[PDB]
């Protein structure tokens, strides 16, 4: 009997001895083995694999509690969609752009780049230490294994067009936004006035206008009673907001906004890229860097800054 010594893991912090024969495939012994992203199910054990770290489908209680507590899903697809993801998503290359860890364009990859480039601006703390553990080590410029579990945790493909207001809904159900809290009066001439109270992700995100002020000023939505009624912020408690609307050209100010998505072309199918306020305006295009101090152009995500917000009306 021939047989090199392994590590099997799910979440590449606990570590399992594993003694392997090399007559019969990783499959036969631990179930679906993953080696970097890359399926090894099938194929048996080299000399150059004795010590390496394999992942593996967790098939006992310690490994189902450890995948839990490392990802927080209990989902048997999602190992094997994270490692299908990361075979891509490590060859990949994320260069510096303006100070922010980028995507070089591939694979339908705009609004994956898009939302890594906003992740890096907005405070956010990740719930799956997967997640979090992933986000440090992309803001420090290695983003492989983050862009992987964002594809992983959104059921999304590489190659399959995404939608960054889409993407960044899943990312921040995934994260602790509890202290978020949003009250919104709506003003009808008939039925009145009531006041709602929204948490967590329905509290950082609207659909409907790109304007922070024009919300707070109040948007005409349709009531229940067939009038048309004033929706406007009433209290904001978050780090951030997120407002976005079907892309139509928009002015950008330097200074009024943290960054924001521009989208070009036909729905779904379209191309997408970043504009971020620094000292001066700057769209990232992947790898691309061009700057100006004024915008116009199709935008459908921007993201302000908050704290606290109490209106004056
Ligand atoms: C509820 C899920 C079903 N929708 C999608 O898969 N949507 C999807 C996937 C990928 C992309 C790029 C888009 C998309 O086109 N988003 C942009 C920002 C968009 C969003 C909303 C309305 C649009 C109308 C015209 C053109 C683009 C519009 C939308
Ligand atoms: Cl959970
Ligand atoms: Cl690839
Ligand atoms: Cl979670
Ligand atoms: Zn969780
Ligand atoms: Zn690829
Ligand atoms: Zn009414």
Wanted: charged share 20%.
């Amino acid at each position: 009997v021939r047989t090199i010594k392994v590590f099997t893991t799910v979440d590449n912090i606990n570590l399992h001895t594993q003694v392997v024969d090399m007559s019969m495939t990783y499959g036969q012994q631990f179930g679906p083995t993953y080696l970097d992203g890359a399926d090894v199910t099938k194929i048996k054990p080299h000399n150059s694999h004795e010590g390496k770290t394999f992942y593996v489908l967790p098939n006992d209680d310690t490994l189902r509690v450890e995948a839990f507590e490392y990802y927080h899903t209990t989902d048997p697809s999602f190992l094997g969609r994270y490692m299908s993801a990361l075979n891509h998503t490590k060859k990949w290359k994320y260069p510096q752009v303006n100070g922010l860890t980028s995507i070089k364009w591939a694979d339908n990859n705009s609004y994956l780049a898009t939302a890594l480039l906003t992740l890096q601006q907005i405070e956010l703390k990740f719930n799956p230490p997967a997640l979090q553990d992933a986000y440090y080590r992309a803001r420090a410029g290695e983003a492989a294994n983050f862009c992987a579990l964002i594809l992983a945790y959104c059921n999304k493909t590489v190659g399959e067009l995404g939608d960054v207001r889409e993407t960044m809904s899943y990312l921040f159900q995934h994260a602790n936004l509890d202290s978020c809290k949003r009250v919104l009066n709506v003003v009808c001439k008939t039925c009145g006035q009531q006041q709602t109270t929204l948490k967590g992700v329905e509290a950082v995100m609207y659909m409907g206008t790109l304007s922070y002020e024009q919300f707070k000023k109040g948007v005409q939505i349709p009531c229940t009673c067939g009038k048309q009624a004033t929706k406007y912020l009433v209290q904001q408690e978050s780090p951030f907001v997120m407002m976005s609307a079907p892309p139509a050209q928009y002015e950008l100010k330097h200074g009024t906004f943290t960054c924001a998505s521009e989208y070009t072309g036909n729905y779904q199918c379209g191309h997408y890229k970043h504009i971020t306020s620094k000292e001066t305006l700057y769209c990232i295009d992947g790898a691309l860097l061009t700057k100006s101090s004024e915008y116009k152009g199709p935008i459908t995500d921007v993201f302000y800054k908050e704290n606290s917000y109490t209106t004056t009306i």
